[PDB]
Amino acid sequence: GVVLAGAALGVATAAQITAGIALHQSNLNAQAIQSLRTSLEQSNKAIEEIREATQETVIAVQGVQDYVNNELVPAMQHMSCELVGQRLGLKLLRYYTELLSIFGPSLRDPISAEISIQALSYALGGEIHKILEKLGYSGNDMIAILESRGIKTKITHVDLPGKLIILSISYPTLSEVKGVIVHRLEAVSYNIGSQEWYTTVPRYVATNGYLISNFDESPCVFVSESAICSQNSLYPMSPLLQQCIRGDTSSCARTLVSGTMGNKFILSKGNIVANCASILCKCYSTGTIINQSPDKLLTFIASDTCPLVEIDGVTIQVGGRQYPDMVYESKVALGPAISLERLDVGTNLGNALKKLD
Amino acid sequence: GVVLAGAALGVATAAQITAGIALHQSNLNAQAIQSLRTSLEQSNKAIEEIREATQETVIAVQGVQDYVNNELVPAMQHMSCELVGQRLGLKLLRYYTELLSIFGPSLRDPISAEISIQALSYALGGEIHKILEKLGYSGNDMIAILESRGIKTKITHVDLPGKLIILSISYPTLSEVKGVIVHRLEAVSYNIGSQEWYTTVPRYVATNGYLISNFDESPCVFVSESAICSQNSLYPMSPLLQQCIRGDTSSCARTLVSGTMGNKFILSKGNIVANCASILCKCYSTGTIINQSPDKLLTFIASDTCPLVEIDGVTIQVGGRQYPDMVYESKVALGPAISLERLDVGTNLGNALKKLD
Amino acid sequence: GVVLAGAALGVATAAQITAGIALHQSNLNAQAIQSLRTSLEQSNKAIEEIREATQETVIAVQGVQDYVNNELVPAMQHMSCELVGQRLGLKLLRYYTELLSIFGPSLRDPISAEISIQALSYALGGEIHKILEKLGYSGNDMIAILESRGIKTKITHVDLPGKLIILSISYPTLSEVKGVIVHRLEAVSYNIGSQEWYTTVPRYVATNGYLISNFDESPCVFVSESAICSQNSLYPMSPLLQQCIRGDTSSCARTLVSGTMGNKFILSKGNIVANCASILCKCYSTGTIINQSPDKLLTFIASDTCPLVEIDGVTIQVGGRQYPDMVYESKVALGPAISLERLDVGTNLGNALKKLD
Amino acid sequence: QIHWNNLSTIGIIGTDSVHYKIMTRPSHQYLVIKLMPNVSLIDNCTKAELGEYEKLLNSVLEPINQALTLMTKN
Amino acid sequence: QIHWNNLSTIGIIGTDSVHYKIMTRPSHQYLVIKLMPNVSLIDNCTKAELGEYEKLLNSVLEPINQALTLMTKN
Amino acid sequence: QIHWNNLSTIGIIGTDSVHYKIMTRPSHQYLVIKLMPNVSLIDNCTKAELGEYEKLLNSVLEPINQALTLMTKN
């Protein structure tokens, strides 16, 4: 038998078809729905575990319980029934405002609707951790801490006399890809003549075997072992970006600084690398400043050149050299300018339009 | 007579001039303002209807009334006057924080200021529906439900001894354009060899007679009859976008997928169209899978090819064919890649800059 | 002596090094930390001034004090200990939700972390003005009003038995750049034949001597004397934008209108300039409308042409002419179209990709 | 109007097509924001906070007040 | 894999490198949003606001309800 | 400095021109965030929620704590 006949439906998409099939995996229609209905009357609980035979435990939510728990006996002198009626009427209309914001008519496709556990907060009573706590996650553990970002919900069923909607949530089950390593990049500023610059590159990069991907910053959280991306995160890259991070900076672009702020020095692998043609680098035990060739763009420091260095009032102890030494850089090209303002890109695409003309 | 002399004003814009003219349409200055002042002293109401002779009814707002309604007699033992004084002082400073966020010095042009009814919520007491309810709109009706997006307010007058600002709001009055039809597009994924792609096009399109416009997604709400755009919504399109949606896909661009997610099948007009060279499509009553030509990119299904089809564990009943059959596609070109990351567009505009050099 | 040895640290950045040096400027580790610990036990104050000898006054914050101040004696009949225990448990878990949003694992670099005084509000008890009030700023004065945007905080120290984090905030100290003038631009619409357009330029411009910069709109507040930018605000411009605002509009681009809305007239320096080939401009005392040459794009009005003008029902008194008169414009070029939709820029960069192919 | 026959070959299927309306503004209505919390019920309380707030109100309003007196008195 | 030796010459220094995990969904769980505040404790109160809200619920739900009856009954 | 005479011919009219200031930081001030709600008034209550929160605090803090011990002790 089918629940899906095309000549009477006409139009539906992939996720909608799979949601209908998964809804028919629920035999709630086959079974009497009165038992579900008749269970939920007397629950009187913010989050309750109502079990269903040969099925997952139903978890029942409520919205606004605590004030009604509060002002029964007191309000008899504390606040009049109408007064509290106005008071409730306010919150209820606020609750309607929230549900009309999220369950309302800006909600596009309720068959394929994907409603995250964060945004439902005041709809789900303003607490998000307790429901996931019921799921069996401590919040003291690897899943609850790293991943609270993307526990998703979907719409399954609507009943009109119960006036209620039935959702079904998923279980976070972590599994690493075989050859995924996430590198968090970072850069320092420098100068050429007097101009001050630094390199414009994507904040993160992600390599899966040979393949290197771009990365999202909004769902993706960083723990010391791995990068947890609770939503699908691996948006692709470009060859003219993927050539940048691997082995060449001939194509990687460069920017001018925001005011006078910039990173003029850094410690990496126990080595101080900086542009000491810009600020004060002075050998501490010897007592003299170090100059730089004008055909060079930075200056690196290991223990052998000077054991302790002063950079504008600090006292830095360094270690052994972990780097090759500074070969000439004037035969390795530098990137073009970057301007992050779509009007400029538009103006010059409108220039591209002029060139086409 | 005039209220507008240019040699003493100097500089003002179009909306500012019209706001000044509409302010002089108000004869509040001509009439005694004491009656307005002296009415508002004893209103003691969150939202009240104070009528004004030969003028629209003034509606008076308040901010924080209910707690002061609450703790008079109880606080005499419940909470000390200073304690409640500190408590109020907190909210009042929060109210000042909100009004300094919105009526403050980030507010650009208070003559032409346009302040929507949504953002004023905690300023207007945290309830938005009741004021529009006073306007005479049910919230059970066509206007309140479809259109709560864009009921706008403007600044009319400021009085210093009353310390108050006078706004005037408009009335939502819906009127359809003569030949406006809104189409919500949608697409499915596919592959060429092993590469997985889908078509990158604007989420909505809007045609007004011959003219086809782009569309906004933030104010525009969808009811079953029409698309309600409460703010001015019809931002223009480009010829090199308008050629895409009408009759040709030779210019429409295509993208690579986000992880492995994609729409490999769809039901449209009672017809299953999919790429069954990618996932499992198998004729149910016959019992065999269907293959696809490598010179083809999808596969369409009507009743005549197979009455019921299985797509990865489902059972689909289809109807009559509503489509022309698959002619060869290799003589119709495909779009270029799309990368939604302004650094890449910037990098390649900086390439365009290199080409200019 | 050092607190910074490179062979044992390995990797750290510029701001992290300076934060470590500034942490060692704090002799809290050198001094007994018990006195700090033992002071904070009995503070019992939302914001307290605990002084530290030969050091700035420590200011102690709390989170949720007032309800615990409220329901001790009353709750003995008003609300059960468990009931209030559940009630508190709710807020506490909400407090954990907020701190896990901001102090949690989405927080990237706590050595270089920059946490503004706005976002910490419900973490810092929901009041922002009082702490700055303690700093000695009225909120009636030039600094508190103009600049509440960017008072920054940074992380200094973490203690585990006290379970507490020690921040150190800065002092707003205003100082103007020597030759910085901020111009807020504005434009009106017009037509050529029947097409309706206006000029697309950056909302603000900022000139520092010869140099002209772009400008940010999110932190930058406008007082009548100066433009206050509490965060570093002066993001750079492009030569192909900087040539636009100074002395030429041959490169400045132009747009088509959003619906029928546009500015068809303006008053500047006591002069009405408009396109009166579009709407009704009629000499009031004479009684006749004024037409425009089709080789012209606007029409300017001073006292000498007509003393009082009517523009669609208004009565405008003008003054003396502050402008040169309308020379022909057909030998001065006009800008290309602008489309603010990255798909279009992407589509045409994908066209640029096709051109490269 | 739409040549959908070219559109389904790479899968462009419009799941909804509706009309479009725009709202118009024939008249107006008055709405007074009284910034002062009109609660004399305060029983001589909040005096200090309201007294600070009074002064706050000058930086709240005055710029706008002048901006409007330039529009009215000229 | 990364040729960092070309990267430090203009200062590209990766302060962290971790793995990557993705979550999978072997099973599901049921969760009923009862939109109606089940508080008969109301003692015959809020009757008017709940009665207005009942009607609100038609514009809240019905579109979705139909969207789901088209998926079920066909 | 601005050649406004070319700017009004297509209508560029600057309604405001002000100066610009930047804030500087001559000194600092100390501010202790005590994450623990110091309310012994709790009368032996919230014990379980605070006891869960104690453990929460390790995932709250420890990463940062280590990040800072690497800066101090090296």
Author numbering:
A (entry chain D), B (entry chain F), C (entry chain B): 227 to 583
D (entry chain E), E (entry chain C), F (entry chain A): 136 to 209
What do the authors of the reporting publication say about this deposited model?
To enter target cells, morbilliviruses rely on an envelope-anchored machinery, which is composed of two interacting glycoproteins: a tetrameric receptor binding (H) protein and a trimeric fusion (F) protein. To execute membrane fusion, the F protein initially adopts a metastable, prefusion state that refolds into a highly stable postfusion conformation as the result of a finely coordinated activation process mediated by the H protein. F protomers contain well-characterized functional domains: an N-terminal signal peptide, N- and C-terminal heptad repeat (HRA and HRB) domains, a transmembrane region and a C-terminal cytosolic tail.
Here, we employed cryo-electron microscopy (cryo-EM) and single particle reconstruction to elucidate the structure of the prefusion state of the CDV F protein ectodomain (solF) at 4.3 Å resolution. Here, to stabilize soluble CDV F ectodomain (solF) in the prefusion state, we fused the trimeric GCNt peptide to the stalk domain, and expressed and purified solF in mammalian cells in the presence of 3G (Sunet al., 2006, Singethanet al., 2010), a derivative of AS-48. Therefore, to ensure a sample of predominantly prefusion state solF for cryo-EM single particle reconstruction, a high concentration (75 µM) of the fusion inhibitor 3G (Sunet al., 2006, Singethanet al., 2010) was present during protein expression and purification. Also after reference-free auto-picking and initial 2D-classification, no postfusion-like 2D classes appeared. This shows that the fusion inhibitor 3G efficiently stabilizes the prefusion state of CDV solF. The geometry of the structure and the fit into the map was improved manually and through several real space refinement runs. The final CDV solF model is shown in Fig. 3A and B, which displays the known “tree”-like fold of the prefusion state of morbillivirus F proteins: The HRB domain of the three chains form a helix bundle, i.e., a short stalk, which supports a large globular head domain consisting of the three subdomains DI, DII and DIII. One DIII subdomain consists of two long α-helices, five shorter α-helices with less than ten residues per helix and a five-stranded twisted antiparallel β-sheet. The fusion peptide (FP), which is built from mostly hydrophobic residues and is important for membrane fusion, is buried between a DII and DIII subdomain of two different monomers. In the CDV solF structure, N173 and N179 are located at the top of the head domain in the DIII subdomain, and N141 is located at the bottom close to the HRB region in the DI subdomain. Interestingly, for all three N-linked glycosylation sites, additional densities were found in the cryo-EM map (arrowheads in the side view of Fig. 3A), which would correspond to glycans. Since 3G is a derivative of AS-48 and the compounds exhibit IC50s for membrane fusion in the single digit micromolar range against CDV and MeV, it is expected that both inhibitors bind to the same site.
